[PDB]
Amino acid sequence: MKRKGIILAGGSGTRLHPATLAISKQLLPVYDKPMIYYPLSTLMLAGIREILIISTPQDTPRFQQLLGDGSNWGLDLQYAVQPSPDGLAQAFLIGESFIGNDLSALVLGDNLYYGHDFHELLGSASQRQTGASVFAYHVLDPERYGVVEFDQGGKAISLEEKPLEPKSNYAVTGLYFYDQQVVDIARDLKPSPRGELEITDVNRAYLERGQLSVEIMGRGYAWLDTGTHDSLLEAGQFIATLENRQGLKVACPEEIAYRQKWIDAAQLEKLAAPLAKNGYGQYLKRLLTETVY
Amino acid sequence: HHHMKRKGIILAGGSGTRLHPATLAISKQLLPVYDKPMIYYPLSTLMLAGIREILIISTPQDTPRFQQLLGDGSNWGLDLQYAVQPSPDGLAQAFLIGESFIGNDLSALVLGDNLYYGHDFHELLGSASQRQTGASVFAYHVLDPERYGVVEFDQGGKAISLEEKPLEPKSNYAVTGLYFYDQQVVDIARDLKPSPRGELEITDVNRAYLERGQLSVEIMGRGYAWLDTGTHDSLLEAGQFIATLENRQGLKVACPEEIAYRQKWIDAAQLEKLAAPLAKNGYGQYLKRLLTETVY
Amino acid sequence: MKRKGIILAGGSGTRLHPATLAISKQLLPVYDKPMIYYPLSTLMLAGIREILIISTPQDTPRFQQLLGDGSNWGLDLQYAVQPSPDGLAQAFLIGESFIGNDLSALVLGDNLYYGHDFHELLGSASQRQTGASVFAYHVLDPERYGVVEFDQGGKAISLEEKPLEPKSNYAVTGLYFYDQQVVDIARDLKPSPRGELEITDVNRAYLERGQLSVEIMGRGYAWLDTGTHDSLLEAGQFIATLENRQGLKVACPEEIAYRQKWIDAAQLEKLAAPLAKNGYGQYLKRLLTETVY
Amino acid sequence: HHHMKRKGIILAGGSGTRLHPATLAISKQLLPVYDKPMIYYPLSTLMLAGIREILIISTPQDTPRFQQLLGDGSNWGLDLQYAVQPSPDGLAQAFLIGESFIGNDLSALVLGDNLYYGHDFHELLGSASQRQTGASVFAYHVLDPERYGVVEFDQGGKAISLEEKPLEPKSNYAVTGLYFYDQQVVDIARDLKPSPRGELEITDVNRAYLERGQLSVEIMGRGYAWLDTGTHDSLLEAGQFIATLENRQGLKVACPEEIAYRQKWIDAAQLEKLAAPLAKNGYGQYLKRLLTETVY
């Protein structure tokens, strides 16, 4: 079966104002590319080509202008809007008809991932055709997130959203795979005390049915924080260090498409043309002739 | 028969494709430098020079976004007006585009991607602003002067030549992106012919003032930071730099609300209203603290 | 068979003076711990407990004071000196009697590694009981290093040290595993045009015999640069971002020992005592009661 | 019957176990801040104040390493002497340990882990150094004044109290780690009794001057950077900050060779000799460039 993707790139309220007064966070750069390139690249690494992008009513034209219909990158992009920030699960209501009868995967528009064999970690989540797969990652501040509690045997036994007193230091990352059950689970959700349709309520629905796979995302992966000005800066510094050391880019969608064999050498060459005078075009050109393992 | 204050221009137009793809969805001057939009810094810089009437020049695509962020200036005791530069034809064009805005007044041009920091910056700007005749620029020692307008000095310290992006610079002293002009500038600008790059050059403007003995070049000392936003790397260094100062001090660099409050262009009651819609984030809480604390 | 380790923490000349005028680079911190903790931790992750540390004649007391005989961390540390910086291969001459008849592994004292499943990448190199295993990593500046050339089939066909015109962008990292042949290969080496006993000559010796395994260290690993002031700063910023995000440390030797089960809970507790008032002791204490996957 | 220049002290002793294990093998003041040892910055700071006779106070373990780095000062036109602090008994102890070094002279105490940057810093130091009677300190607005000596001001700006690490600070104005004293300091220091932390407090010393009407507290403006080296995080921010300024400018912060050359304590011939053993790295190449270039 096929899996479809959703990037939720909606409003972060006034939290980062005035930096985000003018445009939504996910259109701002992390180092050399718009933030949304990173979760888009994530979906593409998981082998997902049909992708729905959800943003504020103000910002859809801007994502649409940036990304197009995706055909240039061998993707099929569609767009939809979240009128108000009423919770992550709302992605599945807005995205209901896009999903139709397929498998799905939700990625948060402001989450960055890096690590060895990230392709396979996604692939093993993508392969599971029933139930939901999520990731748990050790963090210093688990109160900010969906917290997963494990028993002595390592089995996930509870989930709590932003608990006052967290049960472990393991947080559910912003990457979620679901089967055909998600839409129907989402539609039955009731708004939380914070007025939000909670993604953690969707994930707890699968947990009660014993259908939630919680895979550990090991300490050798970087799940980067874009929630504060400070953490945003750290993410830019982290990506810059990696790219300048290696002469290789992180989350370059044109490169990912090309390695997935969704575009051929001749298309990459055309994509390399408009940016030819800067480092990004120079990078895409160099990928035509170099072997990178 | 006919019978002086200074107006400001911020040029925040198209930085071309140079920083694509990071700048595909928005112009550079709306990207943040740490906790605030880049345009806040040159705006705060004009304000520090005592300038309240300011023209913002941007692309047709991005003007509404600048307008949404900044308004007409009334919240901050300013008057902000808007003009478009449909085609990126060079910095000097600001004066053709801003001709009617300028009228018969003195003026100041600042690049919308330029950040400054340092002690007695107010007084440095004040002395350039008080000089009512001729032009005033600032020379700053940089590693890579080939990237800029470069000023050559003689033994006595007098500026004797200006060159734009010379391959072999005569000194390491670059002209910063901040410029003060008398009433002659618009006319100088109209008589310019495009360079062999298809651009109306600010260096040709400054040379004109120099050839007439009316260019003052003041040194901006090594104790000031004139920060680079020309690359992705330098942009990142710029944010790290502001963050270090702000987290150290508990004070902000280029907070426009604060600067208007200190110039006495808005009062305590007005600052309070400015603080309210941001009361739950660090920026609003900072505006509120300014109401009770004495900061020397 | 057993494998023994050598950390070469010798002189970097005047290259970083005056920052390194007072003490050798490998005794300076990267973020929260002395640099040498990182390659030491690397050896320990590869399961190596008997370790020789080589430094300048001036700096051995300082390493000796810092690290002791290792018994507190379940290691067996010995020390030796490199009188002059006459090449990396000299590690095997100085280290000849330490190595005796065993397998060995050399790590450079100023190299930092991070990534998912780094333990297994080392383990698979450590398992090979014959020949030499090295790693190749894509870098922007291959002229600075030992450059490995691959044929269309991906087989390593040449090695050149600091070539004027490098054949690929793949550099041999500062981590090397050898069998019993290394000492004898090293002893027959002749000084290069730069007056150095070249590690690349040792590795080319195994290559000619077809006994050099060149494993790719993928782009999902970070091999960090400590060669310049700028790169040293980047390494500190990179480690700080990882540790503050996760609440977990990179290359904490006490933790690594404890997870390898070379020290028990009661010993970790004693190690946590002197530093109790700072974050490092607080970290070691917290490791007594928390489950970390 | 008996019948004024100023001596300097740098305290670069034990920072305890606080930054262990990073500081297990060497003391903090020899860790680099970017391209140079931390001790270079306070050393350059004393030099900028015109002080040439300087006592370095370190642990018995690390004195030889300070001596190996710095020598007797003769290469840089200074005279450097050494003393040990066997036990970390508090900052004021510098004056008991440095009593014979000081003699009948004025003095200046600087913390060996403190970095300063900004425009007309020379003149700010000059005005503190010229005041021959009483003591001089600097107050700087910080986010976390609870960590420092905190000065309270009245409506007219007069300093009226000093508190060491108060839980509820009276202002955000911290006393920086740079202190100028007349001849009374040693005696004040000898009469101090240890605090309820087992330490001889510089704040008790400064309070003594204040209780006598002889403490001048000058504001160090927000346009100066007074950088934090108290944590691993702030140390990293410190190096990022120097690197940004130096890579921007093609000039160094706190290069002692340069500062002595500019004070005229060494001449061109001497600077050249200093440049030679480092001719192949960036630091030596920088010393050589200083011989031919005019830097304003």
Ligand SMILES: CN(c1c(N)n(Cc2ccccc2)c(=O)[nH]c1=O)S(=O)(=O)c1ccc(F)cc1
């Ligand atoms: C560094 N990574 C990376 C890669 N590993 N690759 C190689 C790769 C490309 C396609 C399929 C499998 C591997 C890339 O072409 N681009 C990359 O950015 S990654 O897999 O950890 C990654 C990929 C996408 C993303 F959004 C974040 C990190």
Ligand SMILES: CN(c1c(N)n(Cc2ccccc2)c(=O)[nH]c1=O)S(=O)(=O)c1ccc(F)cc1
């Ligand atoms: C740190 N600086 C600064 C200040 N000195 N002040 C105080 C001040 C405010 C108005 C007049 C004189 C001084 C501020 O209110 N905000 C500031 O950012 S500054 O002069 O170096 C400056 C000011 C404006 C700007 F855009 C960049 C730097």
Ligand SMILES: CN(c1c(N)n(Cc2ccccc2)c(=O)[nH]c1=O)S(=O)(=O)c1ccc(F)cc1
């Ligand atoms: C982040 N890493 C790491 C770990 N993965 N672990 C977990 C671990 C510990 C022992 C054996 C296998 C795994 C640690 O205890 N400390 C670590 O620093 S690492 O394997 O990539 C590593 C380990 C040692 C080192 F020097 C650099 C990086």
Ligand SMILES: CN(c1c(N)n(Cc2ccccc2)c(=O)[nH]c1=O)S(=O)(=O)c1ccc(F)cc1
């Ligand atoms: C950037 N500064 C500086 C300088 N201004 N100068 C120029 C200078 C040198 C001697 C006297 C007056 C000025 C330097 O030669 N080195 C410097 O680091 S500074 O005044 O802010 C300074 C000086 C010494 C120090 F330790 C830290 C900062």
Ligand SMILES: [Cl-]
């Ligand atoms: Cl892992």
Ligand SMILES: [Cl-]
């Ligand atoms: Cl200056």
Ligand SMILES: [Cl-]
């Ligand atoms: Cl990889």
Ligand SMILES: [Cl-]
């Ligand atoms: Cl100031």
